[PDB]
Protein backbone atom coordinates (compact mmCIF):
# COMPACT_ATOMS: atom_id res chain seq x y z
CA UNK A 1 0.00 0.00 0.00
CA UNK A 2 0.99 3.60 0.65
CA UNK A 3 4.32 4.60 2.14
CA UNK A 4 4.49 6.34 5.50
CA UNK A 5 5.01 9.75 3.88
CA UNK A 6 1.97 9.48 1.63
CA UNK A 7 -0.78 8.48 4.08
CA UNK A 8 -2.50 11.85 4.24
CA UNK A 9 -3.22 11.83 0.49
CA UNK A 10 -6.37 9.75 1.13
CA UNK A 11 -8.03 13.14 1.65
CA UNK A 12 -7.12 14.66 -1.75
CA UNK A 13 -10.14 13.05 -3.45
CA UNK A 14 -13.03 13.73 -1.06
CA UNK A 15 -13.79 17.26 0.21
CA UNK A 16 -15.76 16.15 3.26
CA UNK A 17 -12.75 14.51 4.83
CA UNK A 18 -10.78 17.63 3.88
CA UNK A 19 -13.05 19.70 6.11
CA UNK A 20 -12.64 17.12 8.88
CA UNK A 21 -8.87 17.03 8.63
CA UNK A 22 -8.39 20.81 8.61
CA UNK A 23 -10.82 21.00 11.53
CA UNK A 24 -8.62 18.63 13.49
CA UNK A 25 -5.56 20.73 12.71
CA UNK A 26 -7.48 23.86 13.72
CA UNK A 27 -8.52 22.19 16.98
CA UNK A 28 -4.86 21.39 17.69
CA UNK A 29 -3.60 24.90 16.92
CA UNK A 30 -6.10 26.68 19.15
CA UNK A 31 -5.70 23.80 21.57
CA UNK A 32 -2.04 24.73 21.69
CA UNK A 33 -2.85 28.44 22.03
CA UNK A 34 -4.94 28.01 25.16
CA UNK A 35 -2.60 25.40 26.62
CA UNK A 36 0.46 27.56 26.05
CA UNK A 37 -1.33 30.57 27.51
CA UNK A 38 -2.28 28.52 30.56
CA UNK A 39 1.33 27.41 30.89
CA UNK A 40 2.67 30.94 30.58
CA UNK A 41 0.23 32.42 33.10
CA UNK A 42 1.11 29.64 35.56
CA UNK A 43 4.82 30.59 35.42
CA UNK A 44 4.64 34.35 34.79
CA UNK A 45 5.88 36.58 37.60
CA UNK A 46 3.96 39.88 37.33
CA UNK A 47 5.74 41.47 40.29
CA UNK A 48 8.26 43.71 38.53
CA UNK A 49 7.10 44.91 35.09
CA UNK A 50 9.92 47.46 35.06
CA UNK A 51 12.90 45.19 35.55
CA UNK A 52 11.50 41.68 35.02
CA UNK A 53 9.02 42.09 32.12
CA UNK A 54 7.33 39.42 30.00
CA UNK A 55 10.06 39.08 27.37
CA UNK A 56 12.59 38.66 30.14
CA UNK A 57 10.69 35.66 31.53
CA UNK A 58 10.40 33.55 28.39
CA UNK A 59 6.78 34.43 27.70
CA UNK A 60 6.17 33.71 24.03
CA UNK A 61 2.42 33.98 23.40
CA UNK A 62 1.68 36.38 26.26
CA UNK A 63 3.14 39.32 24.24
CA UNK A 64 0.69 38.39 21.49
CA UNK A 65 -2.34 38.66 23.75
CA UNK A 66 -0.96 41.90 25.20
CA UNK A 67 -0.31 43.28 21.71
CA UNK A 68 -4.02 43.33 20.88
CA UNK A 69 -5.40 44.73 24.13
CA UNK A 70 -5.49 41.93 26.72
CA UNK A 71 -3.68 43.54 29.64
CA UNK A 72 -5.48 42.23 32.73
CA UNK A 73 -5.71 38.95 34.59
CA UNK A 74 -7.98 36.98 36.92
CA UNK A 75 -5.24 37.19 39.56
CA UNK A 76 -5.66 40.95 39.96
CA UNK A 77 -2.45 41.93 38.20
CA UNK A 78 -2.00 43.85 34.96
CA UNK A 79 0.94 44.50 32.64
CA UNK A 80 1.36 48.23 33.19
CA UNK A 81 1.85 47.55 36.91
CA UNK A 82 -1.48 48.08 38.64
CA UNK A 83 -4.41 46.07 39.96
CA UNK A 84 -7.28 45.16 37.62
CA UNK A 85 -10.52 46.18 39.31
CA UNK A 86 -12.64 44.49 36.61
CA UNK A 87 -10.74 41.88 34.59
CA UNK A 88 -13.77 41.18 32.42
CA UNK A 89 -14.21 38.00 30.46
CA UNK A 90 -11.28 38.71 28.10
CA UNK A 91 -8.52 38.17 30.60
CA UNK A 92 -5.49 36.06 29.85
CA UNK A 93 -7.23 33.10 31.44
CA UNK A 94 -10.50 33.90 29.68
CA UNK A 95 -8.75 33.76 26.32
CA UNK A 96 -6.73 30.70 27.36
CA UNK A 97 -10.09 29.09 28.11
CA UNK A 98 -11.76 30.47 24.98
CA UNK A 99 -9.22 28.63 22.85
CA UNK A 100 -9.68 25.35 24.72
CA UNK A 101 -13.48 25.58 24.47
CA UNK A 102 -13.03 26.30 20.77
CA UNK A 103 -10.59 23.36 20.56
CA UNK A 104 -13.24 20.92 21.72
CA UNK A 105 -15.91 22.43 19.50
CA UNK A 106 -13.65 22.10 16.46
CA UNK A 107 -12.84 18.57 17.63
CA UNK A 108 -16.50 17.54 17.58
CA UNK A 109 -17.03 19.21 14.21
CA UNK A 110 -14.17 17.15 12.77
CA UNK A 111 -15.75 13.92 14.02
CA UNK A 112 -18.97 14.99 12.29
CA UNK A 113 -17.35 15.72 8.93
CA UNK A 114 -15.37 12.47 9.11
CA UNK A 115 -18.50 10.36 9.41
CA UNK A 116 -20.72 12.52 7.21
CA UNK A 117 -18.18 12.90 4.44
CA UNK A 118 -20.52 12.05 1.56
CA UNK A 119 -22.44 15.29 1.44
CA UNK A 120 -24.39 16.29 -1.66
CA UNK A 121 -22.71 19.74 -1.55
CA UNK A 122 -19.40 18.19 -2.58
CA UNK A 123 -20.78 16.46 -5.68
CA UNK A 124 -21.28 18.88 -8.55
CA UNK A 125 -24.54 18.68 -10.52
CA UNK A 126 -24.94 16.68 -13.78
CA UNK A 127 -21.70 14.72 -13.45
CA UNK A 128 -22.35 13.44 -9.95
CA UNK A 129 -18.71 13.13 -8.89
CA UNK A 130 -16.93 15.00 -6.11
CA UNK A 131 -15.80 18.39 -7.35
CA UNK A 132 -14.87 21.78 -5.93
CA UNK A 133 -15.30 25.14 -7.66
CA UNK A 134 -11.92 26.50 -6.58
CA UNK A 135 -12.16 29.92 -8.32
CA UNK A 136 -15.44 30.66 -6.55
CA UNK A 137 -14.32 28.94 -3.32
CA UNK A 138 -11.37 31.32 -3.35
CA UNK A 139 -13.77 34.18 -4.04
CA UNK A 140 -15.80 33.25 -0.98
CA UNK A 141 -12.81 33.01 1.34
CA UNK A 142 -11.12 36.14 -0.01
CA UNK A 143 -14.39 37.97 0.62
CA UNK A 144 -14.51 36.78 4.24
CA UNK A 145 -10.82 37.62 4.61
CA UNK A 146 -11.20 41.24 3.56
CA UNK A 147 -14.32 41.48 5.68
CA UNK A 148 -12.41 40.43 8.80
CA UNK A 149 -9.44 42.55 7.71
CA UNK A 150 -11.64 45.64 7.44
CA UNK A 151 -13.37 44.62 10.66
CA UNK A 152 -10.09 44.26 12.54
CA UNK A 153 -8.79 47.52 11.13
CA UNK A 154 -11.74 49.86 11.42
CA UNK A 155 -13.12 48.54 14.72
CA UNK A 156 -10.54 46.61 16.75
CA UNK A 157 -7.36 48.59 15.99
CA UNK A 158 -8.92 52.03 15.53
CA UNK A 159 -10.76 51.70 18.84
CA UNK A 160 -14.12 52.52 17.29
CA UNK A 161 -15.49 49.37 18.86
CA UNK A 162 -12.52 47.22 19.87
CA UNK A 163 -9.78 48.05 22.37
CA UNK A 164 -6.80 48.93 20.15
CA UNK A 165 -3.21 47.78 19.86
CA UNK A 166 -0.05 48.41 21.88
CA UNK A 167 1.59 51.79 21.28
CA UNK A 168 4.71 52.94 23.11
CA UNK A 169 7.21 55.79 23.00
CA UNK A 170 10.47 55.49 20.99
CA UNK A 171 12.34 54.38 24.11
CA UNK A 172 10.06 51.67 25.49
CA UNK A 173 9.22 53.49 28.72
CA UNK A 174 5.60 54.64 28.46
CA UNK A 175 3.57 51.99 26.68
CA UNK A 176 -0.14 51.15 26.82
CA UNK A 177 -2.95 49.79 24.71
CA UNK A 178 -4.70 52.80 23.23
CA UNK A 179 -6.67 53.33 20.01
CA UNK A 180 -4.88 54.63 16.94
CA UNK A 181 -6.01 56.77 14.14
CA UNK A 182 -5.34 55.63 10.56
CA UNK A 183 -2.68 57.57 8.67
CA UNK A 184 -3.33 57.84 4.95
CA UNK A 185 -0.33 59.86 3.80
CA UNK A 186 3.16 58.63 3.09
CA UNK A 187 3.57 58.24 6.87
CA UNK A 188 1.39 55.12 6.86
CA UNK A 189 4.15 53.09 5.23
CA UNK A 190 6.68 53.84 7.94
CA UNK A 191 6.36 50.50 9.78
CA UNK A 192 7.14 52.11 13.14
CA UNK A 193 3.92 54.07 12.76
CA UNK A 194 1.03 52.19 14.41
CA UNK A 195 -1.37 54.32 12.39
CA UNK A 196 -0.22 52.57 9.24
CA UNK A 197 -1.43 49.27 10.65
CA UNK A 198 -5.00 50.56 10.98
CA UNK A 199 -4.70 52.30 7.62
CA UNK A 200 -3.47 49.01 6.14
CA UNK A 201 -6.35 46.80 7.25
CA UNK A 202 -8.96 49.32 6.16
CA UNK A 203 -7.45 49.77 2.69
CA UNK A 204 -6.42 46.13 2.27
CA UNK A 205 -9.71 45.06 3.81
CA UNK A 206 -11.77 47.10 1.36
CA UNK A 207 -9.69 45.94 -1.61
CA UNK A 208 -9.90 42.35 -0.37
CA UNK A 209 -13.68 42.66 -0.35
CA UNK A 210 -13.67 44.14 -3.87
CA UNK A 211 -11.27 41.47 -5.10
CA UNK A 212 -13.43 38.85 -3.41
CA UNK A 213 -16.45 40.09 -5.34
CA UNK A 214 -14.43 39.73 -8.54
CA UNK A 215 -13.48 36.10 -7.91
CA UNK A 216 -17.06 35.27 -6.89
CA UNK A 217 -18.45 36.39 -10.24
CA UNK A 218 -15.83 36.39 -13.00
CA UNK A 219 -14.86 32.86 -14.00
CA UNK A 220 -11.19 32.40 -14.94
CA UNK A 221 -9.74 32.16 -18.40
CA UNK A 222 -9.44 28.76 -20.02
CA UNK A 223 -5.79 29.40 -20.91
CA UNK A 224 -5.15 30.38 -17.30
CA UNK A 225 -7.23 27.42 -16.10
CA UNK A 226 -4.82 24.87 -17.58
CA UNK A 227 -1.63 26.87 -17.09
CA UNK A 228 -2.19 27.11 -13.34
CA UNK A 229 -3.95 23.70 -13.14
CA UNK A 230 -7.01 25.21 -11.39
CA UNK A 231 -8.92 21.92 -11.38
CA UNK A 232 -6.60 20.42 -8.77
CA UNK A 233 -6.81 20.90 -5.01
CA UNK A 234 -3.01 20.82 -4.94
CA UNK A 235 -2.40 23.88 -7.13
CA UNK A 236 -4.08 25.86 -4.38
CA UNK A 237 -1.86 24.10 -1.82
CA UNK A 238 1.34 25.02 -3.68
CA UNK A 239 0.27 28.63 -4.07
CA UNK A 240 -0.85 28.82 -0.44
CA UNK A 241 2.44 27.40 0.84
CA UNK A 242 4.03 30.04 -1.38
CA UNK A 243 1.81 32.59 0.34
CA UNK A 244 2.73 31.51 3.87
CA UNK A 245 6.49 31.44 3.54
CA UNK A 246 6.39 34.88 1.92
CA UNK A 247 4.38 35.95 4.93
CA UNK A 248 6.71 34.17 7.37
CA UNK A 249 9.76 35.96 5.98
CA UNK A 250 7.96 39.29 6.36
CA UNK A 251 6.68 38.36 9.82
CA UNK A 252 10.06 37.15 11.08
CA UNK A 253 11.71 40.07 9.31
CA UNK A 254 9.66 42.70 11.11
CA UNK A 255 10.04 40.83 14.38
CA UNK A 256 13.83 40.87 14.06
CA UNK A 257 14.17 44.43 12.76
CA UNK A 258 11.40 45.74 14.97
CA UNK A 259 8.14 47.37 13.91
CA UNK A 260 5.09 49.08 15.37
CA UNK A 261 3.49 45.63 15.33
CA UNK A 262 6.38 44.38 17.53
CA UNK A 263 6.80 46.67 20.55
CA UNK A 264 9.92 46.40 22.65
CA UNK A 265 7.99 46.40 25.90
CA UNK A 266 6.42 43.12 24.77
CA UNK A 267 9.19 41.42 22.80
CA UNK A 268 12.32 43.10 24.10
CA UNK A 269 14.80 45.34 22.34
CA UNK A 270 16.33 44.49 19.00
CA UNK A 271 19.94 43.68 18.21
CA UNK A 272 20.19 46.83 16.10
CA UNK A 273 19.43 48.93 19.18
CA UNK A 274 22.48 47.64 21.02
CA UNK A 275 24.61 47.94 17.88
CA UNK A 276 23.54 51.44 16.90
CA UNK A 277 23.64 52.75 20.48
CA UNK A 278 19.93 53.51 20.62
CA UNK A 279 19.33 53.64 24.37
CA UNK A 280 22.89 54.69 25.19
CA UNK A 281 22.49 57.88 23.17
CA UNK A 282 19.22 58.72 24.92
CA UNK A 283 20.70 58.01 28.36
CA UNK A 284 23.46 60.44 27.42
CA UNK A 285 20.88 62.82 25.95
CA UNK A 286 19.13 63.02 29.33
CA UNK A 287 22.29 63.41 31.42
CA UNK A 288 23.45 66.25 29.18
CA UNK A 289 19.95 67.73 29.39
CA UNK A 290 20.50 67.96 33.14
CA UNK A 291 24.17 68.96 33.28
CA UNK A 292 23.40 71.85 30.92
CA UNK A 293 20.50 73.15 33.01
CA UNK A 294 22.68 73.03 36.12
CA UNK A 295 22.83 69.88 38.24
CA UNK A 296 25.24 67.45 39.82
CA UNK A 297 26.32 64.15 38.31
CA UNK A 298 24.70 61.96 40.97
CA UNK A 299 21.52 64.06 40.82
CA UNK A 300 21.32 63.75 37.02
CA UNK A 301 21.93 60.00 36.80
CA UNK A 302 19.21 59.46 39.41
CA UNK A 303 16.68 61.06 37.04
CA UNK A 304 17.09 58.29 34.45
CA UNK A 305 14.42 55.57 34.70
CA UNK A 306 15.65 52.16 35.82
CA UNK A 307 13.68 50.68 32.89
CA UNK A 308 15.65 52.75 30.36
CA UNK A 309 18.98 51.56 31.75
CA UNK A 310 17.80 47.96 31.43
CA UNK A 311 17.33 48.24 27.67
CA UNK A 312 20.97 49.39 27.52
CA UNK A 313 22.37 46.00 28.41
CA UNK A 314 23.87 43.19 26.34
CA UNK A 315 21.92 40.50 28.15
CA UNK A 316 18.64 41.78 26.77
CA UNK A 317 20.06 41.85 23.25
CA UNK A 318 18.27 39.02 21.37
CA UNK A 319 21.40 38.09 19.42
CA UNK A 320 23.40 37.23 22.54
CA UNK A 321 22.01 33.75 22.85
CA UNK A 322 22.42 30.13 21.95
CA UNK A 323 20.45 27.51 20.11
CA UNK A 324 20.46 25.11 23.06
CA UNK A 325 20.69 27.71 25.81
CA UNK A 326 17.06 26.99 26.58
CA UNK A 327 14.49 28.93 28.52
CA UNK A 328 13.92 32.38 29.93
CA UNK A 329 16.38 35.23 29.79
CA UNK A 330 16.24 35.17 33.60
CA UNK A 331 17.66 31.65 33.50
CA UNK A 332 20.88 33.02 32.06
CA UNK A 333 22.14 35.95 34.09
CA UNK A 334 19.49 35.95 36.82
CA UNK A 335 16.43 38.00 37.61
CA UNK A 336 17.36 41.67 37.55
CA UNK A 337 16.81 43.24 40.95
CA UNK A 338 18.13 46.78 40.87
CA UNK A 339 20.19 49.10 38.74
CA UNK A 340 23.54 49.26 40.46
CA UNK A 341 24.58 52.70 39.17
CA UNK A 342 26.55 54.21 36.32
CA UNK A 343 30.23 53.29 36.41
CA UNK A 344 32.40 56.30 35.56
CA UNK A 345 36.13 55.69 35.22
CA UNK A 346 38.95 58.11 35.97
CA UNK A 347 42.71 57.59 35.99
CA UNK A 348 45.43 59.30 38.05
CA UNK A 349 45.76 62.18 35.56
CA UNK A 350 42.12 63.15 36.20
CA UNK A 351 40.95 61.96 32.78
CA UNK A 352 37.62 60.24 32.20
CA UNK A 353 37.59 56.73 30.73
CA UNK A 354 34.98 54.85 28.73
CA UNK A 355 34.72 51.08 28.45
CA UNK A 356 34.58 49.85 24.87
CA UNK A 357 31.37 47.83 24.92
CA UNK A 358 31.22 44.22 23.83
CA UNK A 359 30.03 43.98 20.21
CA UNK A 360 27.21 41.57 19.49
CA UNK A 361 29.45 39.01 17.74
CA UNK A 362 31.83 38.51 20.63
CA UNK A 363 31.31 35.68 23.07
CA UNK A 364 34.32 37.06 24.96
CA UNK A 365 35.81 40.48 24.45
CA UNK A 366 38.85 42.17 26.03
CA UNK A 367 38.08 45.09 28.30
CA UNK A 368 39.46 48.40 27.07
CA UNK A 369 39.11 51.84 28.62
CA UNK A 370 39.28 54.63 26.05
CA UNK A 371 39.55 58.37 26.61
CA UNK A 372 37.33 61.15 25.26
CA UNK A 373 39.09 61.24 21.88
CA UNK A 374 38.97 57.45 21.42
CA UNK A 375 42.49 56.32 22.40
CA UNK A 376 42.99 53.28 24.63
CA UNK A 377 44.47 54.24 27.99
CA UNK A 378 43.81 51.26 30.25
CA UNK A 379 42.96 47.59 29.84
CA UNK A 380 43.02 44.31 31.72
CA UNK A 381 46.01 42.81 29.91
CA UNK A 382 46.45 39.18 29.03
CA UNK A 383 50.21 39.30 29.51
CA UNK A 384 51.01 41.03 32.81
CA UNK A 385 54.77 40.48 32.66
CA UNK A 386 55.71 43.84 31.12
CA UNK A 387 52.51 45.84 30.74
CA UNK A 388 52.00 49.49 29.82
CA UNK A 389 48.19 49.86 29.98
CA UNK A 390 47.35 47.99 33.17
CA UNK A 391 44.64 49.34 35.46
CA UNK A 392 47.11 49.05 38.36
CA UNK A 393 49.67 51.47 36.90
CA UNK A 394 47.26 53.83 35.13
CA UNK A 395 45.34 54.11 38.40
CA UNK A 396 41.76 53.57 37.28
CA UNK A 397 39.14 54.33 39.91
CA UNK A 398 35.43 53.83 39.37
CA UNK A 399 32.63 56.00 40.75
CA UNK A 400 28.93 55.29 40.43
CA UNK A 401 26.10 57.76 39.93
CA UNK A 402 22.52 56.85 40.67
CA UNK A 403 21.47 53.32 41.36
CA UNK A 404 22.26 51.22 44.40
CA UNK A 405 25.91 52.33 44.63
CA UNK A 406 25.33 56.08 44.32
CA UNK A 407 28.19 58.30 45.44
CA UNK A 408 30.43 55.30 46.14
CA UNK A 409 33.98 55.02 44.81
CA UNK A 410 36.14 51.94 44.26
CA UNK A 411 39.90 52.25 43.84
CA UNK A 412 40.85 48.62 44.54
CA UNK A 413 42.52 47.19 41.39
CA UNK A 414 40.63 43.92 41.86
CA UNK A 415 37.25 45.65 42.33
CA UNK A 416 37.75 48.04 39.39
CA UNK A 417 38.50 45.13 37.04
CA UNK A 418 35.28 43.45 38.13
CA UNK A 419 33.14 46.45 37.26
CA UNK A 420 35.09 47.19 34.09
CA UNK A 421 34.13 43.73 32.86
CA UNK A 422 30.50 44.40 33.78
CA UNK A 423 30.54 47.81 32.09
CA UNK A 424 31.32 46.33 28.68
CA UNK A 425 28.06 44.41 29.03
CA UNK A 426 26.12 47.66 29.36
CA UNK A 427 24.59 49.32 32.40
CA UNK A 428 25.44 47.71 35.73
CA UNK A 429 22.78 45.55 37.36
CA UNK A 430 22.38 43.33 40.39
CA UNK A 431 20.95 39.86 39.77
CA UNK A 432 20.19 36.74 41.79
CA UNK A 433 21.60 33.40 40.62
CA UNK A 434 19.75 31.58 43.41
CA UNK A 435 16.05 32.13 42.60
CA UNK A 436 16.17 30.21 39.32
CA UNK A 437 19.70 28.68 39.67
CA UNK A 438 20.98 30.62 36.70
CA UNK A 439 23.69 29.23 34.45
CA UNK A 440 25.70 32.40 33.95
CA UNK A 441 25.56 32.77 30.18
CA UNK A 442 22.90 34.72 28.33
CA UNK A 443 19.81 33.61 26.43
CA UNK A 444 17.84 35.07 23.55
CA UNK A 445 14.54 36.91 23.89
CA UNK A 446 11.25 35.72 22.38
CA UNK A 447 12.04 38.23 19.62
CA UNK A 448 14.97 35.98 18.72
CA UNK A 449 13.12 32.70 19.18
CA UNK A 450 10.13 33.75 17.09
CA UNK A 451 12.50 34.83 14.33
CA UNK A 452 14.35 31.51 14.47
CA UNK A 453 11.20 29.44 14.05
CA UNK A 454 9.66 31.62 11.39
CA UNK A 455 12.68 31.65 9.13
CA UNK A 456 13.28 27.91 9.57
CA UNK A 457 9.60 27.42 8.80
CA UNK A 458 9.73 29.90 5.93
CA UNK A 459 12.69 28.05 4.45
CA UNK A 460 11.24 24.56 4.85
CA UNK A 461 8.05 25.90 3.33
CA UNK A 462 10.02 27.02 0.32
CA UNK A 463 10.77 23.34 -0.29
CA UNK A 464 7.13 22.41 0.25
CA UNK A 465 6.20 25.00 -2.32
CA UNK A 466 8.74 23.40 -4.65
CA UNK A 467 7.42 19.90 -3.97
CA UNK A 468 3.74 20.69 -4.30
CA UNK A 469 4.16 22.97 -7.30
CA UNK A 470 6.02 20.14 -8.97
CA UNK A 471 3.31 17.61 -8.17
CA UNK A 472 0.67 19.72 -9.95
CA UNK A 473 2.62 20.52 -13.12
CA UNK A 474 3.89 16.94 -13.23
CA UNK A 475 0.73 15.26 -11.98
CA UNK A 476 0.46 12.98 -15.02
CA UNK A 477 4.01 11.63 -14.66
CA UNK A 478 4.02 11.17 -10.90
CA UNK A 479 4.01 7.36 -11.01
CA UNK A 480 6.55 7.28 -13.85
CA UNK A 481 7.11 8.24 -17.45
CA UNK A 482 5.71 6.69 -20.62
CA UNK A 483 7.46 3.92 -22.52
CA UNK A 484 7.61 5.76 -25.87
CA UNK A 485 9.06 9.07 -24.69
CA UNK A 486 12.15 8.90 -26.90
CA UNK A 487 10.85 11.52 -29.37
CA UNK A 488 12.48 14.36 -27.40
CA UNK A 489 15.93 13.99 -28.99
CA UNK A 490 17.26 14.67 -32.48
Amino acid sequence: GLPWYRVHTVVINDPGRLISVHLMHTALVSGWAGSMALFEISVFDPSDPVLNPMWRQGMFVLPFMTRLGITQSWGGWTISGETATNPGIWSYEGVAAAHIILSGALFLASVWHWTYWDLELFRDPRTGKTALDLPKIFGIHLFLSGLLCFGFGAFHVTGVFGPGIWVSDPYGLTGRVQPVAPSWGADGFDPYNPGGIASHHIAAGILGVLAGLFHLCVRPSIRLYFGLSMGSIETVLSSSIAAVFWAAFVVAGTMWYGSAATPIELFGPTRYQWDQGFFQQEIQKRVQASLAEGASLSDAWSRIPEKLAFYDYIGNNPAKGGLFRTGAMNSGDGIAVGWLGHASFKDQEGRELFVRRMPTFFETFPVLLLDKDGIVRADVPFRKAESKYSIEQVGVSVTFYGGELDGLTFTDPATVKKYARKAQLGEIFEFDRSTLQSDGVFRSSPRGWFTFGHVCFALLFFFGHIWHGARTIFRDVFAGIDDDINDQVE
Binding site: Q276, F278, Q280, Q281, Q284, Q288, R356, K372
Partner: peptide, 24 residues
Protein backbone atom coordinates in the same frame (compact mmCIF):
# COMPACT_ATOMS: atom_id res chain seq x y z
CA UNK B 1 33.89 67.94 29.10
CA UNK B 2 32.56 65.24 26.76
CA UNK B 3 29.92 65.55 24.07
CA UNK B 4 27.35 62.77 23.77
CA UNK B 5 28.89 62.02 20.35
CA UNK B 6 32.43 61.39 21.61
CA UNK B 7 31.11 59.37 24.54
CA UNK B 8 29.34 56.95 22.19
CA UNK B 9 32.36 56.88 19.89
CA UNK B 10 34.82 55.32 22.43
CA UNK B 11 32.14 53.03 23.86
CA UNK B 12 30.37 51.57 20.82
CA UNK B 13 31.58 53.36 17.60
CA UNK B 14 28.76 51.69 15.64
CA UNK B 15 26.42 54.30 17.08
CA UNK B 16 23.74 55.95 14.96
CA UNK B 17 24.96 59.28 16.36
CA UNK B 18 28.53 58.49 15.35
CA UNK B 19 27.78 57.11 11.89
CA UNK B 20 25.49 59.75 10.38
CA UNK B 21 26.84 63.23 9.52
CA UNK B 22 30.38 61.79 9.65
CA UNK B 23 31.68 63.77 6.68
CA UNK B 24 33.48 66.19 9.02
Amino acid sequence: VTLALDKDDPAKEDSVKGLRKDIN
